[PDB]
Design an enzyme around this catalytic site. Sequence first.
Site, PDB file in Angstrom:
ATOM      1  N   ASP A   1      55.974  57.388  59.977  1.00 14.06           N
ATOM      2  CA  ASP A   1      55.858  58.830  59.739  1.00 14.06           C
ATOM      3  C   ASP A   1      54.475  59.353  60.107  1.00 14.06           C
ATOM      4  O   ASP A   1      53.922  60.214  59.427  1.00 14.06           O
ATOM      5  CB  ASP A   1      56.228  59.141  58.269  1.00 14.06           C
ATOM      6  CG  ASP A   1      56.686  60.587  58.052  1.00 14.06           C
ATOM      7  OD1 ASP A   1      57.102  61.284  59.009  1.00 14.06           O
ATOM      8  OD2 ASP A   1      56.637  61.041  56.885  1.00 14.06           O
TER       9      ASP A   1
ATOM     10  N   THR B   1      59.950  63.224  61.532  1.00 10.33           N
ATOM     11  CA  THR B   1      59.931  64.587  62.033  1.00 10.33           C
ATOM     12  C   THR B   1      60.169  64.574  63.538  1.00 10.33           C
ATOM     13  O   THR B   1      59.429  63.889  64.243  1.00 10.33           O
ATOM     14  CB  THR B   1      58.543  65.214  61.726  1.00 10.33           C
ATOM     15  OG1 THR B   1      58.429  65.384  60.306  1.00 10.33           O
ATOM     16  CG2 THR B   1      58.381  66.575  62.405  1.00 10.33           C
TER      17      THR B   1
ATOM     18  N   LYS C   1      51.894  61.601  61.792  1.00  9.13           N
ATOM     19  CA  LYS C   1      51.845  62.994  62.264  1.00  9.13           C
ATOM     20  C   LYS C   1      50.636  63.638  61.618  1.00  9.13           C
ATOM     21  O   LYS C   1      50.112  63.127  60.635  1.00  9.13           O
ATOM     22  CB  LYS C   1      53.114  63.751  61.901  1.00  9.13           C
ATOM     23  CG  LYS C   1      53.454  63.790  60.431  1.00  9.13           C
ATOM     24  CD  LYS C   1      54.727  64.577  60.151  1.00  9.13           C
ATOM     25  CE  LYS C   1      55.094  64.464  58.692  1.00  9.13           C
ATOM     26  NZ  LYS C   1      56.187  65.429  58.349  1.00  9.13           N
TER      27      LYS C   1
ATOM     28  N   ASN D   1      50.059  63.928  57.872  1.00  2.00           N
ATOM     29  CA  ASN D   1      49.838  62.675  57.162  1.00  2.00           C
ATOM     30  C   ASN D   1      48.506  62.007  57.492  1.00  2.00           C
ATOM     31  O   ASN D   1      48.309  60.834  57.204  1.00  2.00           O
ATOM     32  CB  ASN D   1      51.020  61.713  57.400  1.00  2.00           C
ATOM     33  CG  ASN D   1      52.241  62.115  56.610  1.00  2.00           C
ATOM     34  OD1 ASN D   1      52.145  62.871  55.624  1.00  2.00           O
ATOM     35  ND2 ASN D   1      53.409  61.645  57.037  1.00  2.00           N
TER      36      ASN D   1
ATOM     37  N   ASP E   1      51.069  59.044  52.855  1.00  2.00           N
ATOM     38  CA  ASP E   1      52.537  59.150  52.842  1.00  2.00           C
ATOM     39  C   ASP E   1      53.286  57.968  53.441  1.00  2.00           C
ATOM     40  O   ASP E   1      53.787  58.023  54.572  1.00  2.00           O
ATOM     41  CB  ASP E   1      53.065  60.441  53.448  1.00  2.00           C
ATOM     42  CG  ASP E   1      54.508  60.702  53.053  1.00  2.00           C
ATOM     43  OD1 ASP E   1      55.203  59.772  52.546  1.00  2.00           O
ATOM     44  OD2 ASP E   1      54.950  61.864  53.210  1.00  2.00           O
TER      45      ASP E   1
HETATM   46  O1  LIG Z   1      52.612  64.484  51.444  1.00  4.06           O
HETATM   47  C1  LIG Z   1      52.752  65.876  51.123  1.00  4.06           C
HETATM   48  C2  LIG Z   1      51.408  66.560  51.232  1.00  4.06           C
HETATM   49  O2  LIG Z   1      50.656  66.349  50.018  1.00  4.06           O
HETATM   50  C3  LIG Z   1      49.297  66.047  50.349  1.00  4.06           C
HETATM   51  N1  LIG Z   1      49.010  64.667  49.841  1.00  4.06           N
HETATM   52  C4  LIG Z   1      49.867  63.633  49.749  1.00  4.06           C
HETATM   53  N2  LIG Z   1      49.225  62.574  49.205  1.00  4.06           N
HETATM   54  C5  LIG Z   1      47.946  62.967  48.921  1.00  4.06           C
HETATM   55  C6  LIG Z   1      46.816  62.349  48.345  1.00  4.06           C
HETATM   56  N3  LIG Z   1      46.760  61.053  47.881  1.00  4.06           N
HETATM   57  C7  LIG Z   1      47.879  60.102  47.884  1.00  4.06           C
HETATM   58  C8  LIG Z   1      47.427  58.823  47.186  1.00  4.06           C
HETATM   59  C9  LIG Z   1      48.643  58.266  46.450  1.00  4.06           C
HETATM   60  C10 LIG Z   1      49.436  59.499  46.037  1.00  4.06           C
HETATM   61  C11 LIG Z   1      48.937  60.640  46.915  1.00  4.06           C
HETATM   62  N4  LIG Z   1      45.674  63.079  48.241  1.00  4.06           N
HETATM   63  C12 LIG Z   1      45.598  64.359  48.646  1.00  4.06           C
HETATM   64  N5  LIG Z   1      46.666  64.966  49.182  1.00  4.06           N
HETATM   65  C13 LIG Z   1      47.834  64.292  49.328  1.00  4.06           C
HETATM   66  C14 LIG Z   1      49.158  66.232  51.853  1.00  4.06           C
HETATM   67  O3  LIG Z   1      48.802  67.601  52.088  1.00  4.06           O
HETATM   68  C15 LIG Z   1      50.556  65.987  52.353  1.00  4.06           C
HETATM   69  O4  LIG Z   1      50.797  66.605  53.634  1.00  4.06           O
END
Ligand SMILES: OC[C@H]1O[C@@H](n2cnc3c(NC4CCCC4)ncnc32)[C@H](O)[C@@H]1O
Length: 278
Positions: free
Chosen positions: A138, A179, A140, A143, A160
């Site tokens: 995934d 996607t 992109k 991510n 992600d």
């Molecule tokens: O994935 C959906 C959206 O949320 C945002 N996003 C997803 N994961 C994160 C994260 N840390 C991951 C560490 C373990 C759990 C999280 N930190 C900040 N933003 C995130 C990003 O904008 C992404 O495009």
Amino acid sequence: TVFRQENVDDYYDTGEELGSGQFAVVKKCREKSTGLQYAAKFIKKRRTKSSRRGVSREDIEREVSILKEIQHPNVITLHEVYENKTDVILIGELVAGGELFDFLAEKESLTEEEATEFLKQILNGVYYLHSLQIAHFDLKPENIMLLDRNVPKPRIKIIDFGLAHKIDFGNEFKNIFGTPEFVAPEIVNYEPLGLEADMWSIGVITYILLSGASPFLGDTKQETLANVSAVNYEFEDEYFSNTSALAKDFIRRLLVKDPKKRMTIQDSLQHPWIKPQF
Ligand SMILES: OC[C@H]1O[C@@H](n2cnc3c(NC4CCCC4)ncnc32)[C@H](O)[C@@H]1O
């Protein structure tokens, strides 16, 4: 495998929402005992076996098992996992500088140096994952997160891992599909998938970094997918007249239909430009 079933609110306070997927919401949070800050990804569980809503236990467990293995500066870390009747809650590394990629949208066009500074970090993260026989599936710009903006110095972390798989037999066959703009032809054609699909996605990301344009994007998802399968892209002079022939060469060697003929992650690091659904 089971996870921590105490109430996550007894141990963390949540704040700002950081982002969303179809079955997940990510929130900033703070651990009460340490004052340290994390991102909590709340993944909706399936309410039955035959439900189309939510994420299956098997899929959640796979993502968690992958996240537990990895430790690299260009990939997220996992801190804790909680669960209750409705959600599994991953508590992991807060990446606070936003998406690549909102940075690309906010910013004017990039220089080749800018693009390669980002790209080298993505390649290092993927080299780590592929060395572990982990395909992300995934990749992109949404991510790819900055850690940092600000320190620019613009360091990145891949996020992600919801589609990520261990590839222990060279390929996986099970209907993984990301996607449309970023998926490889073998995804579009429902063929066995391996580490090569990530390398195609890197080629697409590189094309976008340099040009601001998406190579296969049509007006509908079916058009995009048809374009990907046919390798219907070209370097538009209006976007690429400033761009070096080596940069184009790098992309051309990734955007290859036959996975066996595509550059590998190791090839990508040795390339003269880099070497120092419905
Ligand atoms: O994935 C959906 C959206 O949320 C945002 N996003 C997803 N994961 C994160 C994260 N840390 C991951 C560490 C373990 C759990 C999280 N930190 C900040 N933003 C995130 C990003 O904008 C992404 O495009």
